[PDB]
Structures are given as structure tokens and as C-alpha cells.
Amino acid sequence: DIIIATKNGKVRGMQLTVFGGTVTAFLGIPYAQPPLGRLRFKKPQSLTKWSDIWNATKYANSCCQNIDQSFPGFHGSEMWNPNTDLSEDCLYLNVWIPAPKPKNATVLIWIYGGGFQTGTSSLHVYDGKFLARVERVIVVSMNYRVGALGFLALPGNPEAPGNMGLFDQQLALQWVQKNIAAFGGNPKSVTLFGESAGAASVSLHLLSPGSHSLFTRAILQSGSFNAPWAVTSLYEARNRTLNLAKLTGCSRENETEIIKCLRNKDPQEILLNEAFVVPYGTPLSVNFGPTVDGDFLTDMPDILLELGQFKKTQILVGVNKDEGTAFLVYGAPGFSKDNNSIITRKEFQEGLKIFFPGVSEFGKESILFHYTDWVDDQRPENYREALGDVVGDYNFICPALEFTKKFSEWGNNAFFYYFEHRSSKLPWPEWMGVMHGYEIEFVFGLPLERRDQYTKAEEILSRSIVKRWANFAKYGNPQETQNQSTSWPVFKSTEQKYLTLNTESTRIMTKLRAQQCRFWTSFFPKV
Ligand SMILES: *[C@@H]1O[C@H](CO[C@@H]2O[C@@H](C)[C@@H](O)[C@@H](O)[C@@H]2O)[C@@H](O[C@@H]2O[C@H](CO)[C@@H](O)[C@H](O)[C@H]2NC(C)=O)[C@H](O)[C@H]1NC(C)=O
Ligand SMILES: *[C@@H]1O[C@H](CO[C@@H]2O[C@@H](C)[C@@H](O)[C@@H](O)[C@@H]2O)[C@@H](O[C@@H]2O[C@H](CO)[C@@H](O)[C@H](O)[C@H]2NC(C)=O)[C@H](O)[C@H]1NC(C)=O
Ligand SMILES: COCCN(C[C@H]1CCCN(Cc2ccccc2)C1)S(=O)(=O)c1ccc2ccccc2c1
Ligand SMILES: *[C@@H]1O[C@H](CO[C@@H]2O[C@@H](C)[C@@H](O)[C@@H](O)[C@@H]2O)[C@@H](O)[C@H](O)[C@H]1NC(C)=O
Ligand SMILES: *[C@@H]1O[C@H](CO[C@@H]2O[C@@H](C)[C@@H](O)[C@@H](O)[C@@H]2O)[C@@H](O)[C@H](O)[C@H]1NC(C)=O
Ligand SMILES: *[C@@H]1O[C@H](CO[C@@H]2O[C@@H](C)[C@@H](O)[C@@H](O)[C@@H]2O)[C@@H](O)[C@H](O)[C@H]1NC(C)=O
Ligand SMILES: *[C@@H]1O[C@H](CO)[C@@H](O)[C@H](O)[C@H]1NC(C)=O
């Protein structure tokens, strides 16, 4: 039996057997008052003390969310769908501590992705027991509100201020600050890491002054706030908040009254309507996401980034080789996970309509032009690979690169990686390559489990990545100093060196996707 006293009461965890060792897991610790009733859409409220022994022995409810129903029974999609009950009562977190209890361990806080519409900390690929066992770090992860329940925005108005999901995250960071010492943790040594919308969240915590004292360092996997999907403007936010009020018959004039009306609607009603608050959706739509609330976010984050207004610290940033492909099978014509998705020119052209609906004709022509001068005009994968690259470059790679350039210009050490290994247990077909999110299992050390049909080469890659992540958290330097590893150079805005992660050869390369990103980062914003 293992009971830990925390500032709001006592929590009992459970022992886990890992690699002939032991990790203690505290699954499902509440960190806020359930945001129910009048608390729906408000910032997370402080939790009142309890007196019992809170049995934190299983993952808690995941936050309300729509589920991917596109490939029922297919592990490739369903591995991302929630694996606990959905409920508004979902403000909980998890802690993995090494056994024997550490003395002053570095803490790793995970923030999952999901487009700010989906996700949950309890997923199998977010299990922190391996990191705890292997690197003697403590791993924390939290559930935070997503979708309209997490980001509906009536700016100024506290009933619906926006960014509630971010303040959930923040409230969990405070919990780590006030309690992790009791678990053997070092509150002065906290590294946030997250993927996709989780990564954009991490990057917004570097910008938010209310978070500056809640962590030390930051890791951003396939995501950053300057990505086009990561921040809703005050305009869209209001137009989307107003739209949703219509589809639920909640339209009023008293802005506080439309919120009260939305407060008596059932979570399901709000959920089915989220999709249509935009006129033309894409597979990448983030109908309700972070906004400039004037609280968490005091100005538009591009301006903050550009003028050096963020926490000064080290960052680890990276992306995957095929960020875009995963979204092509959610709408792009001629694409399917069940055939090699050879598409024609017209099909590529139609796909751009799917992914760039509001963009001018000339804008879409300019995308086609920049991506369709072929090394081989006769190669039939040409247009299929091109659309994937378009989506990946525009949505993930180029914003992550631009974020890393701008952040490092203010003097801090930055490290950039390019993950280019396809999981041998990847259930999607080969033409989709090194997909969005399929580095996570490697970061969390799943390939270390020899019982799980990963190759030996994958075990070695996960083992080095785990060491590099942990070295970055403990020491601000993501080296593997022992097994004659390739040294990871800092990313500088001049030379722009990055490290490639793969089973073959880790290499130092320069200026990732240079020609592509100049199009996205300096021509395309004009159109
Ligand atoms: C701001 O919102 C209006 C309203 O959107 C419509 O109503 C919602 C409840 C939802 O069902 C949406 O899908 C609707 O489109 C947008 O106005 C509509 O725009 C579309 C296409 O642009 C048009 O076909 C509709 O007739 C419009 N309806 C009205 C009442 O004007 C408007 O475009 C949004 N603003 C922006 C910049 O997108
Ligand atoms: C690849 O598959 C897509 C998806 O269509 C579905 O999946 C197939 C594997 C098969 O089960 C089809 O019967 C399904 O409809 C194909 O796209 C469809 O193509 C048909 C004609 O071929 C067209 O009428 C539909 O509109 C298309 N639907 C979509 C969503 O694109 C595609 O043609 C296949 N291409 C190759 C090269 O295999
Ligand atoms: C409910 O269905 C909505 C569609 N979603 C996408 C699907 C398809 C792609 C695979 N993912 C699983 C997945 C993989 C990796 C990390 C996290 C999750 C689910 S989404 O809601 O998850 C979504 C939305 C907008 C985004 C905008 C920018 C980047 C990612 C986005 C994801
Ligand atoms: C909390 O759990 C207590 C005991 O839990 C069980 O016994 C221990 C030794 C572990 O094996 C644990 O995994 C078991 O589930 C209960 O006695 C107590 O009533 C519980 N309190 C609740 C449910 O509120
Ligand atoms: C635990 O360790 C603390 C020092 O943390 C270290 O310094 C900060 C600035 C970070 O760089 C972090 O990564 C380092 O590991 C001590 O100040 C503290 O008193 C120690 N407390 C206990 C109980 O061991
Ligand atoms: C490093 O490699 C270990 C096994 O390799 C042997 O030990 C190291 C220290 C070298 O001296 C090498 O020449 C030997 O062949 C693994 O057990 C260990 O987990 C690896 N560590 C990392 C971080 O990858
Ligand atoms: C909006 O509602 C609040 C709370 O009831 C009220 O105080 C305020 O006057 C209303 N504003 C209007 C009606 O413009």
C-alpha cells in the first residue's frame, strides 16, 4: 500500500511491474472542481479539500468530445478514440513515480493533442510507466476540456471567456508545483511536452505569463501556436459562438443569457452542432480553439513571438516526415487507406479545394505551381505525394520551423529533429509514410517492451529518444552521451542544423524544406 498526502487530501496509488521493476501509478487525481452546471464554460475552479483516501487507481472520465467514426473497427483510427467514459466531470490527472520513490526527480508533464477537439490522457500511447521506470523521471499527464466546452469564446465575458482548456492545463501545472515534491518530484525541474494541439498548447504556455513560473523547459512534437489551425481570431470565435447559439435555439441579445441557455443544453446537443459553426469545414478544422482572451493570451501570439515576449528557456522542437498524409483519407477525393491512392491532376486540384476552401483561385493555383514542377513528370505518385506534402508543410513543418527560428533569435538554445521512421506496427498503409502522431509511441518507450512485436532496431531508437528527451528535461541538452551517438547541435537561425531520427543513420542536416517553407511563410500569407 502506498498513500501520498497532498494539499487537498490523501491519495492511494497502485504498484506496477515494469521491466523487472516497479513503478507507482496514481491514475485519476482530481485537480479542479468538476466544471458542471453553472461552471460549464467557466475557468476551472479551485478544488475543495477532501478527507478520505482518494483511490487513484484507474484512469478517470475523458472530457466530452466527438469520436472519429470514419474507420469503425480499424485500430489505426480507433487507437486515438477515448478509452474511458466521456463526461463533463473530467478534470483529472495522472502521476507515474519511479520505485523506489525518487528523492528529487525531474518531472515530465504531457499535454495530448487532438485538434483541441479530441484527446485524453488515458490513451495507451501516453502511458508514462516506461519513462518513469527507465529514466527515473516522474511523468504527469492531465485531461483538459476540448471543443466548445473547452474553448467557446465570448471575449471579456467570464461566463465564456475562451481558453478554458488552457486554464485547465495551467491549473494542473499549479498542482504539480504545489504537490509533486510530496511524490518525490522537483517542482523546479518541470519539462512540458505535447504533440500536435498538445504541442501548440506547450508553445502557448511559453507565451502566457501566468504559466512562466510553472515549468522549466518545453518540448514541441509536430505543433506550435503559429500553425494556421492553432489560434482562432476574436472574429471567428464570436461568429462561431453566435452560430452555435443558433443551432441550439439559444440565440439571444444578452450575451450572458445565450450562455445560460447553452448551460442547460445537453453535452451531446452542443457536440453535434460544433461541426457546422463554420461554413466550409476541412479535416483540419479547429472549430473551437485558443483565442486572444486578454487573460491567458494578452495579444496575438505571432506579435509576441516576433518581439521576443515569451519565457526564455530551452526548447526541443520537431516534426515527422509525413505529417500531412493522415488527413488525406478524411475527405480528399481519390484517397483511401485501402488502396495506394494514386490520384490525377484534377484530383489533386480538387483536394486543394477540400483543404483550402476559402482560398482564392489564384491562391490554389500558386500552391499547385509551387508543388507540381516534377523531377519526374511521369512518376504516378507525383500528385499523391504532393498533396500530402502540401498539407504537412503548411500545417505542421513550416510553422514549427518558423517558430524555432524566431524563438532561438532571442538567445536560447533550441534543438530541432526530423522523425523519419515508420513504425513496423503502423496499421495504416505504406503510402502514408511516417504519419502524424506516430513518433509518440517511440517517445513514450513502448518499443522498449519486448513483448510487443516492435523490431530490435525500434527498441534501440526508442531507447535513444527516451534518453535524449530525459536528458533534455533534466539538463536542457538532448544528448545521448554514452553510446557514441551523433551529437545534436543547437538550432541557429543562420545554419539551421537539425537531427534526423531513424533506425538507419542519425544525421545532421541543414535547412529543412527550405524552398517549400519560403512559399508558405512569405508568399502564401499574402493571398
Ligand atoms: C458567420 O456566420 C454566418 C452564419 O453561418 C451559417 O449559419 C450557421 C448556423 C451554420 O449553419 C453555417 O454552416 C452557416 O453558413 C455565415 O453566413 C453564411 O455563409 C454561407 C457561406 O459563406 C452562406 O451560404 C449562408 O447563406 C450565410 N448565412 C448567413 C445567415 O449569412 C458567415 O459566412 C460567417 N462569417 C464568416 C466570415 O465565415
Ligand atoms: C481508391 O479508393 C477510393 C475510395 O473509394 C472506396 O474505396 C475503394 C477501396 C472501394 O471499396 C470503392 O468501392 C469505395 O467507394 C476510390 O474513390 C472512389 O472511386 C469511385 C470510382 O472508382 C468514385 O465513384 C468515388 O466517388 C470515389 N470515392 C472517393 C471517396 O474518392 C478510388 O477511386 C480508389 N483509387 C484507386 C487508385 O484504387
Ligand atoms: C472527431 O474527428 C475530427 C477529426 N480529427 C482528426 C482525426 C484524423 C487524424 C488522426 N486523428 C488522431 C490523432 C493523431 C495524432 C494526434 C492526435 C490525434 C484524428 S481531430 O479532431 O483529431 C483534429 C482536428 C483538427 C486538427 C488540426 C490540426 C492538427 C490536428 C487536428 C486534429
Ligand atoms: C479504496 O480502496 C480500498 C482498498 O482497495 C483495495 O485494496 C487494496 C489493498 C488494493 O489492492 C486496491 O487495488 C484494492 O482495490 C477500499 O478498502 C476502500 O473502501 C476504497 N474506497 C473507496 C472505493 O471509496
Ligand atoms: C531539489 O533540487 C533543487 C534544484 O533544482 C535544480 O535547479 C533548477 C534551477 C533546475 O535547473 C533543475 O533542473 C535542477 O535540477 C533544489 O533547489 C531543492 O532544494 C532540492 N530539494 C530537495 C528536497 O531535494
Ligand atoms: C547503450 O548500449 C547498451 C549496450 O551496449 C553496450 O554498452 C554501452 C555502454 C557501450 O559500451 C556499447 O559498446 C556496448 O556494446 C544498452 O544496454 C543501453 O541501454 C544503451 N543506452 C542508450 C541510452 O541507448
Ligand atoms: C446581460 O445579463 C446580465 C446578467 O443577468 C445583466 O446584468 C445585463 O444587464 C445583461 N445585459 C444586457 C441585457 O444588455
Among residues 62, 189, 196, 211, the one annotated as catalytic is 196
Residue 415 near residue 315 (C-beta atoms within 8 A) = yes
3-state secondary structure of 501: strand
Q: Residue 429: CB within 6 Å of ligand 2?
A: no
Put residue 71 in one of left, alpha, beta given phi > 0 → left and psi -120 to 50 → alpha.
beta
Please tell me the residue having the least CA distance from ligand 5 atom 9: 188
115 annotated ligand binder: yes
Beta strand residue intervals within 68-152, DSSP E = 92-98, 105-111, 138-142
Strand partners, 105: 185
Query: How far does the centroid of ligand 3 lie from the alpha carbon of residue 213, in Å?
Result: 30
Q: Beta 138-142 vs 497-501: how paired, if at all?
A: unpaired
Q: Which of 106, 107, 177, 188 to mutate to test the pocket of ligand 5 (most atoms within 8 A of CB)?
A: 188
Task: Give the single-character DSSP code of 523.
Answer: I
3-state secondary structure of 256: helix
Residue 109 near residue 201 (C-beta atoms within 8 A) = no
Q: Beta 21-30 vs 92-98: how paired, if at all?
A: antiparallel
Annotated active-site residue 323? The verdict is yes
Query: How far does the centroid of ligand 6 lie from the alpha carbon of residue 460, in Å?
Result: 9
Amino acid identity, residue 197?
Answer: A
**In this structure, what is the dihedral angle of CA atoms 443, 448, 450, 451, given to the nearest 10 degrees?**
-50
Ligand in closest contact with the CA of 191: 5
Q: Residue 256: CB within 6 Å of ligand 7?
A: yes
For the CA of 466, the nearest atom of ligand 6: 23
Burial 145-177 (b: 16+ CB within 10 A, else e): bbbbbbbbbbbeeebbbbbbbbbbbbbbbbbbb
For the CA of 485, the nearest atom of ligand 6: 24
Q: Residue 182: CB within 6 Å of ligand 5?
A: no
Q: Which of 107, 109, 189 to mutate to test the pocket of ligand 5 (most atoms within 8 A of CB)?
A: 189
Q: Which of 68, 70, 395 to mutate to test the pocket of ligand 3 (most atoms within 8 A of CB)?
A: 68
Q: Which of 394, 224, 417, 220 is nearest to 304 (CA)?
A: 224
CA distance 177 to 46: 15
165 annotated ligand binder: no
First to last CA, the chain: 62
Query: How far does the centroid of ligand 7 lie from the alpha carbon of residue 255, in Å?
Result: 7
Count each helix (H run) and each strand (E run) in the chain, helices first: 17, 14
**Total residues found in the chain within this entry:** 527
**In this structure, what is the dihedral angle of CA atoms 492, 302, 121, 218, given to the nearest 10 degrees?**
30
351 annotated ligand binder: no
3-state secondary structure of 301: helix
Q: Which grid cell sits at 298?
A: 494578452
Among residues 159, 323, 402, 420, the one annotated as catalytic is 323
Ligand in closest contact with the CA of 260: 7
Q: What is the CATH number of domain 2-527?
A: 3.40.50.1820
How many C-beta neighbours within 10 Å does residue 353 have? 15
For the CA of 463, the nearest atom of ligand 6: 24
How many C-beta neighbours within 10 Å does residue 310 have? 23
Query: How far does the centroid of ligand 7 lie from the alpha carbon of residue 252, in Å?
Result: 11
436 annotated ligand binder: yes
Among residues 421, 436, 441, 462, the one annotated as catalytic is 436
Query: How far does the centroid of ligand 7 lie from the alpha carbon of residue 254, in Å?
Result: 5
